Amino acid sequence: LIATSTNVIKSEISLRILASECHLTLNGIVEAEAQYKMGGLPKSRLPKIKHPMIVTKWVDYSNKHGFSYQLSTEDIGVLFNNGTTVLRLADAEEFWYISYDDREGWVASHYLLSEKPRELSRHLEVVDFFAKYMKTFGREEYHKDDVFLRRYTRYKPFVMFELSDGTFQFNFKDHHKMAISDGGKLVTYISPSHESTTYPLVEVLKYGEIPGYPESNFREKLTLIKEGLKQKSTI
Ligand SMILES: [Zn+2]
Ligand SMILES: [Zn+2]
C-alpha cells in the first residue's frame, strides 16, 4: 500500500493515540478471524449492534486552505493545514475548535457562531465555503456522541478515515464502504445506494460475505483493511 496523501500530524502524543486505535481494532479483526477459524466463544456478552458515525461526504482541494468532510450527523468538519479542526455542528449555531494539546493530544473548545472569536474569523470563512459546498467533547447530552476526523489516508484502492471515537471507515473504488467499530468487533456495510447495515464481524466471516451483497468482495476488502491498519500502526 502506497499512500498518495494523508494529513500531517505534528504531535507525537496524537500519533501514539492514533496508532493505539489502529493496533486495537486490528487485534479485534484478527481475534474475530480466530473465532471463525478455531471456534472459541468469548465469555463476554456479544457486541450490542450500534450504527457508527460515518463520513458521508468529503473533498480534498489544494487551494481552499483545508480538507473537508460531512458526517452522518450532518456536522461539517474542516481539517486545516496546520492540523487544527473546526467542527461545525449541523444546527449551524455551535462549533468546536480542535487543536493540539501536550497532555491529551487533542483539545476541543466550545463556541457559538454568533459569538465567534476574532482569532478564528478566517477559519469560519473557510468553514462557510465548505458548508455551501456540502449543501474530547465533554459529557453534555448534546455533545456526548460528538466525533471528528483525526486522520485520513488516500490509497489507490481505498481512502481510510480514522474517527475520534475509534471507528475506522474505508471507502473503496467500487463505492462499497465499510466501517469497523467497537475495537474491530463490528462491521458496518454501506452499499453503493447508501443502505447501511451493521453486523458482528465474526458473523460475517462465518457467512463468508456481506448479507445481501455478494458482489462486495468482502474477503479482499478485509485484507486491504488489515494492511491499512497494520501500516498506520507503525507511525
Ligand atoms: Zn497490544
Ligand atoms: Zn453545545
Residue numbers in the entry: 460 to 594, 602 to 701
The authors write:
Like Plks, Cdc5 contains a Ser/Thr kinase domain followed by a polo-box domain that mediates substrate recognition and sub-cellular localization. The polo-box domain is made up of two polo boxes that together define the p(S/T)-binding pocket. Cdc5 promotes the release of Cdc14 from the nucleolus and regulates the mitotic exit network (MEN)9,16–18 as well as cytokinesis. Here we demonstrate that the polo-box domain of Cdc5 uses distinct surfaces to bind phosphorylated and non-phosphorylated substrates.
We determined the crystal structure of the polo-box domain of Cdc5 using a fragment of Cdc5 that included residues 418–705. Similar to other previously determined structures of Plk1, the extension preceding the polo-box domain (residues 418–459) was disordered in the structure, while residues Leu460-Asp705 adopted the characteristic polo-box domain fold with the first polo-box defined by the β1-β2-β3-β4-β5-β6-α2 structure elements, and the second by the β7-β8-β9-β10-β11-β12-α3-α4 structure elements. The loop connecting the two polo boxes (Ala594-Ser601) was disordered in this structure. The distance between the last ordered residue from the first polo-box (Lys593) and the first ordered residue in the second polo-box (Thr602), as well the conformation of residues Thr602-Asp611 folding back towards β5-β6 rather than reaching across the first polo-box towards α2, suggested that the loop may had been proteolytically cleaved during crystallization. The side chains of Glu553, His569 and His609, as well as that of His524 from a symmetry related molecule, coordinate a zinc metal ion from the crystallization solution.
